[PDB]
Design a binder for this molecule. Structure first.
Ligand SMILES: NCC(=O)NS(=O)(=O)OC[C@H]1O[C@@H](n2cnc3c(N)ncnc32)[C@H](O)[C@@H]1O
Ligand SMILES: NCC(=O)NS(=O)(=O)OC[C@H]1O[C@@H](n2cnc3c(N)ncnc32)[C@H](O)[C@@H]1O
Ligand SMILES: [Zn+2]
Ligand SMILES: [Zn+2]
Lengths: 275, 295
C-alpha cells in the first residue's frame, strides 16, 4: 500500500490493526490542524469536548444500531458479585474464558463526535432564531480492522454542527462546503468534493481512482430534531446538519502529500499551520 | 457534595455518571496544565500518544485481571453472521434486547496510560545504559460510576515512564516527587505527598494493598477537595519493580529483567482541583498562577 512507509515516522504498533501509538511528529500535525480548524470557527459557536464514550441509550435512540450495527463498539464489564468476578478470573487462570461474565454497560464507544450534542441542545428548550451552532470533538470508534493507515478503528473526529430550521442548516452546509475547500487548498491538498444528503472532500492517497474521504458534509433532515424533541423558533421539529473533519485522515493526507520532513513543507502551508 | 457547585461552568451531562461533556472554560485549563507538564519534560524523553483503546491480550498479559477486574471496560460488538446481526437489530426494533448477541472484541478501553508502552519498549531489544524515558497520555476508562466530579469513568491520564535498572527508576521517582510538589506549589494548590495503595479487588486485594503500602511502591499527591480528612489523589508515583520487565522480557544494560516506574498526572482531577481552589473566573486567578499557565 502507498501509505505504508509513513508508519515508520508516524506510528508504533499496539498489537491491533487500526489501533496505533502516535509519535511526537504525527501528534504535532494533528494539533496544528485542530488549531487551524478552530481559527475558522464562526461567531456564536459553542465548543464542547466529548470523551471517547457516550450513553448507549442515546446512541440506540439515534438510530445507529440500525445503519451500522457491525461497526458499533459497546462497553461491557464484570458487573457481578465479588464471588462471580473472582470465579471469572479463576477460569482465565485455568485456561478458560473470563469474558462469559461480561454484561453490557450503559455506555458505547462513540462512532461519531456529534451524537451526544442533540440531547444536550434539546434539554435547553426551544431554539432561538437562527438556531444553535456547536463545535464538537471526540475520539471515535468504528469496528473496521484494516492494515491501511487511512482506515482506523480508533480515530479523532472534529465537527461543526447546525441545529435550526432547514434554511439555517442549508446556509450552514453551503458556507462550510466553500470554507472546507478553501482550508484544503491552504493546506496544499489535492481534492474533489463529491456526493457520497452527504458530500465528502476526497483526497487521493493510494489511488486517484479510489480517493479517501477526509471531511464530510451531512444533512440529517429532522431525524435528530424529532428523536430528541428539538423545537425550532417557529415551534417546528428542528433540522440538523454537520461538517466533520477526519483528524487522522487529514494528518495522514498532509504527510502523504508533503512528506515527513516539516522543514521541506511549502512556506504557505508552514505559515498557515504556524510552523 | 462540595464540588457540585462547579458543574455548571465546567461540564454538561451526557446521561451517564462520571461521563461529561467539557466546556471551553474547563478544556482551556486542561490544555494549559498539559502544556505546563510538557515544559517539565526531561531531555531524551520519547513522547507517545495512545488512543482510548488497547490490545485486550496485552492487558491480560499485564496482569490487570489479577488486580482490578471490576474496573475493566471491555470492547464488545456484534461479531456474528449477517443473519445473527439482522436478528439482533430486529429484536431491538421489537422492544427486545439486542445486547445478547454481543461478544468481546480483541480490545479493551485503556485503564492506565502507560500499559501499551512496555511491549513497545521490549520490541527494541536490550535497554541502553541509563534506560528509556517515555511521555505518554491516553483517555482512560475505569468502571467506577459516581456523581462526584473528581471520580470519573472516562478521564485523561498523562505520565512520565522510566524503564531501566532499579537505580534508574528509583532516581526518576525521587526526582519526580520533588518536581511534582514544586509544580503543585506553582499552581497555588494545597497538598501532601503520602504512602498509598492501589484499590486492589476483593479479599486478596486488602492483603495486596497493605503489602504495597508497607513496600512504599506507591505515593500520591493528595489535595483536599472536600476536607483534609478525605483528600483527592491528583498524581501518583508508582514503582513497579520488575513486573513489566519480566512480563515483556525487557532486558536492562546488565542483561537483567528491567525495573519500571511511572509518574501519573490525573488531568481531570488537577483541572477540578484548580477550579475548586481558584474559582471559575480566570481573570481573578493569582498572578503567579496565571503567569505559569501563560494566561
Ligand atoms: N458526524 C459525521 C460523521 O460521522 N461523518 S462520516 O464521514 O462518518 O465521518 C467523518 C469523517 O471521519 C473520518 N473517518 C471515518 N471513518 C474513519 C476510519 N475508519 N478511520 C479514520 N478516519 C475515519 C473521515 O475523514 C470521515 O470523513
Ligand atoms: N499508571 C499510573 C496509574 O494508573 N496510576 S493511578 O491509578 O494512581 O492513576 C493516576 C491518576 O489518575 C487519576 N485518576 C484515577 N482514577 C480516576 C477517576 N476515577 N477519575 C478521575 N481521575 C482519576 C488520579 O489523579 C490518579 O492519581
Ligand atoms: Zn456529525
Ligand atoms: Zn503508569
Amino acid at each position: 500500500d502507498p501509505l505504508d512507509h509513513l508508519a515508520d515516522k508516524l506510528f508504533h504498533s499496539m498489537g491491533s490493526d487500526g489501533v496505533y501509538a502516535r509519535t511526537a511528529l504525527y501528534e504535532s500535525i494533528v494539533e496544528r490542524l485542530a488549531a487551524l480548524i478552530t481559527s475558522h470557527r464562526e461567531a456564536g459557536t459553542e465548543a464542547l469536548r466529548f470523551p471517547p464514550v457516550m450513553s448507549r441509550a442515546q446512541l440506540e435512540k439515534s438510530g445507529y444500531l440500525k445503519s451500522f450495527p457491525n461497526l458499533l463498539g459497546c462497553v461491557c464489564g464484570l458487573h457481578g458479585t465479588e464471588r462471580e468476578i473472582n470465579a471469572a478470573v479463576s477460569r482465565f487462570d485455568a485456561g478458560g474464558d473470563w469474558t462469559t461474565s461480561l454484561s453490557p454497560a450503559d455506555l458505547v464507544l462513540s462512532p461519531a463526535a456529534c451524537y451526544p450534542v442533540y440531547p444536550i441542545a434539546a434539554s435547553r428548550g426551544p431554539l432561538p432564531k437562527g438556531g444553535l451552532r456547536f463545535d464538537v470533538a471526540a475520539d471515535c470508534f468504528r469496528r473496521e480492522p484494516s492494515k491501511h493507515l487511512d482506515r482506523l478503528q480508533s480515530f479523532r473526529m472534529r465537527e461543526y454542527v447546525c441545529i435550526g430550521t432547514p434554511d439555517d442548516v442549508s446556509d450552514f452546509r453551503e458556507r462550510w462546503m466553500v470554507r472546507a475547500q478553501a482550508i484544503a487548498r491552504d493546506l496544499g491538498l489535492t481534492f474533489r468534493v463529491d456526493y457520497a444528503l452527504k458530500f465528502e472532500l476526497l483526497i487521493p492517497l493510494r489511488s486517484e481512482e479510489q480517493p479517501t474521504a477526509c471531511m464530510s458534509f451531512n444533512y440529517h433532515r429532522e431525524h435528530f430534531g424529532t428523536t430528541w424533541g428539538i423545537q425550532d423558533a417557529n415551534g417546528e421539529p428542528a433540522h440538523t446538519g454537520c461538517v466533520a473533519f477526519g483528524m487522522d485522515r487529514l494528518a495522514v493526507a498532509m504527510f502523504h502529500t508533503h512528506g515527513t520532513d516539516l522543514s521541506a513543507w511549502p512556506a504557505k502551508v508552514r505559515d498557515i499551520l504556524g510552523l
